[PDB]
C-alpha cells in the first residue's frame, strides 16, 4: 500500500489491520481472479478525478501483476463509454507517462 | 427503447453511439466479458440503481455472466467506493 | 417543492437567502436566463438524481418554452462529458416528460 | 444494518464479519463521539444521490441515537453549501417525510 | 491533448469515433456551438478535474472568443447546482487562466 | 483571494455568498464546530485535494479543530466513500 496507508499504520494500527484484512478478502474472489479484479479497480478509480489514485492503481497493477499498458488501455475504453471524454483523456495521459 | 427514440429523432447521433459502443467493446487484448465486468463495477460505484440493475441484467442475459461473478465485482466496489454503493448493489443483485 | 415549502415555513432566513441566491445566480452579466437554465439542465443531467433532472427539464419547458429537441442538444453534451449511463437516463426522462 | 448487509451475511460470512469490525472501529472515534460521526455520515450520504441510503442513515440515526429532525436539518445546511440545491432539496424532502 | 495524440497514433478506430462523436455532439438541432460549449464548461466545472476545467475554458476563449464574464455566468449556475467548493475552484481557475 | 476577485467584479454575487455562508453556519441546534467537521467530511469524500487541504487548514486555524478530530471525520469517509478517499485525505492530514 502507498503513503496514505503507511500514515494509517502509524496513527491507527488496529484500523490499519482491519483495512488490510478487508483488502485481502475483497481480492479473494470466488470466481474472478485477482488480475480481473485489479483491472476493475483501475476502471473505477479512472472514472473519477483522483489523478494520484489513478497513477498508483496503474503503477501497482503493472508492477505487482504484470498488467500491460495495452490491457489498461482496454479498461480505459470502458471508462470513456461509462464516464465521458474528460475521464478518458486524463487517464490516457497518465497511462502514457507511466 | 429510449435509444429507440434517439434512432428515430437523431439518426446521426444514434449511429455514432452504436459505433462508440462497438469500438469500445472491441478490445485489443481484454475480452468482451472482462470489459463488461469493468462496466458493471464503474456503474455500481455510483448511485444510479437503474443503470446498475440494467447493466447486471444485460450482462447475465447477453453474456452468461453469473451472480457470483457480479458479486466479485462488487467486492472491488466496496473497497473503492464504500459501504453505501456496495450494500445498494448487493440488494439489487439479490433481486435478480 | 415539498423540500422548499418546509424550509420556507421552518427556516425563513435560510429560505430567504436561497431565493436571493437563485435570483442572483440567474441574473447573469452577459448570458441570458434561457442559456443559464440549459446549463443547469446539463449539470444535473450529468449526475444521478432523477428528480432534479425531471424538475429542471419540466420547469425549463414550462417557464421558458424550451423544447425537447433543445434539451436533447444539452444531452448531447452530457454524453460527451459524462458517458452513456447519464445520457441514456436523462434521455429516457426527457422522452417520458 | 439494512437489507444489503443481510444479503452479505447470507452470501459472504467472512466478508460480512470484517465489514462489521470495520464499522465498529470507524465509529470508535478517539475524540469525536458517535453522534457527531453519524451526523457526518448523514452529511456525506446526503451530498450524493442515493435516496434510499439517505433515508436509511437518517432513520437509523433518529432511531438508534435519538438524533432530531432539527439536528439533521442543520447537517443539511452544510450539504447546501458544499453540494448545491439539488442535494439539499432532495434531502430536505426525505427528512420531512420521515 | 497528449492523451489524444497517443490514441490517434495507437488506436485509430477509437480516435476516429471520438472525433466523430465530438463533431456530432456539437452539431445541435437547435442550440448553437457556443451554447453547447458553455454547457460543457458548466458540467466539467461541477466536478473535480482541474485539467478538464482549464481546457474547456481555454478552448472556449480561444475557439469562440468567449469572455471571462461569460464563463463566470456559467459558474453562477455551478454554485447553485453544485456548491461552494466547485464554484471557488472553478473561479480561481478562471481568474488565473 | 479568488473570492477577492468575485467581490470586485460581482458584488451582488459576493454579498449573497457571504450571507449563504453565514446563514448555513448559524445552526438551530448544532454548533459551528460540528458543522465544520461535517463540511470536512463531505469535501474529503470527493477528489478535490485543494478543497480538502484548505478545509482542514482553515478548520485548524479558525476553530482549533485538532488533527485527531479530523482523523475521526476521515474514519467516516472511509466507510461511506472507500479507500481512495480515505488514504488521500490521511496523506493530506499528515502534511498539515
UniProtKB/Swiss-Prot annotation, chains B, F:
<comment type="similarity">
    <text>To M.jannaschii MJ1511.</text>
</comment>
<dbReference type="Pfam" id="PF02627">
    <property type="entry name" value="CMD"/>
</dbReference>
<dbReference type="GO" id="GO:0016491">
    <property type="term" value="F:oxidoreductase activity"/>
</dbReference>
<dbReference type="GO" id="GO:0051920">
    <property type="term" value="F:peroxiredoxin activity"/>
</dbReference>
<dbReference type="InterPro" id="IPR029032">
    <property type="entry name" value="AhpD-like"/>
</dbReference>
<dbReference type="InterPro" id="IPR003779">
    <property type="entry name" value="CMD-like"/>
</dbReference>
<protein>
    <recommendedName>
        <fullName>Uncharacterized protein MJ0742</fullName>
    </recommendedName>
</protein>
Curated annotation (Swiss-Prot), chains C, E:
<dbReference type="InterPro" id="IPR029032">
    <property type="entry name" value="AhpD-like"/>
</dbReference>
<dbReference type="GO" id="GO:0016491">
    <property type="term" value="F:oxidoreductase activity"/>
</dbReference>
<dbReference type="Pfam" id="PF02627">
    <property type="entry name" value="CMD"/>
</dbReference>
<dbReference type="InterPro" id="IPR003779">
    <property type="entry name" value="CMD-like"/>
</dbReference>
<comment type="similarity">
    <text>To M.jannaschii MJ1511.</text>
</comment>
<protein>
    <recommendedName>
        <fullName>Uncharacterized protein MJ0742</fullName>
    </recommendedName>
</protein>
<dbReference type="GO" id="GO:0051920">
    <property type="term" value="F:peroxiredoxin activity"/>
</dbReference>
Amino acid at each position: 500500500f502507498g503513503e496514505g496507508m503507511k500514515v494509517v499504520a502509524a496513527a491507527y494500527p488496529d484500523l490499519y489491520d482491519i483495512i488490510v484484512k478487508l483488502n485481502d478478502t475483497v481480492f479473494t474472489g470466488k470466481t474472478l481472479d485477482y488480475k480481473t479484479q485489479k483491472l476493475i479497480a483501475i476502471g473505477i478509480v479512472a472514472s473519477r478525478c483522483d489523478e494520484v489514485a489513478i497513477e498508483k492503481q496503474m503503477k501497482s497493477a503493472m508492477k505487482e501483476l504484470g498488467i500491460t499498458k495495452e490491457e489498461i488501455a482496454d479498461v480505459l475504453r470502458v471508462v470513456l463509454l461509462t464516464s465521458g471524454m474528460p475521464a478518458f483523456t486524463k487517464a490516457m495521459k497518465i497511462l502514457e507517462k507511466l
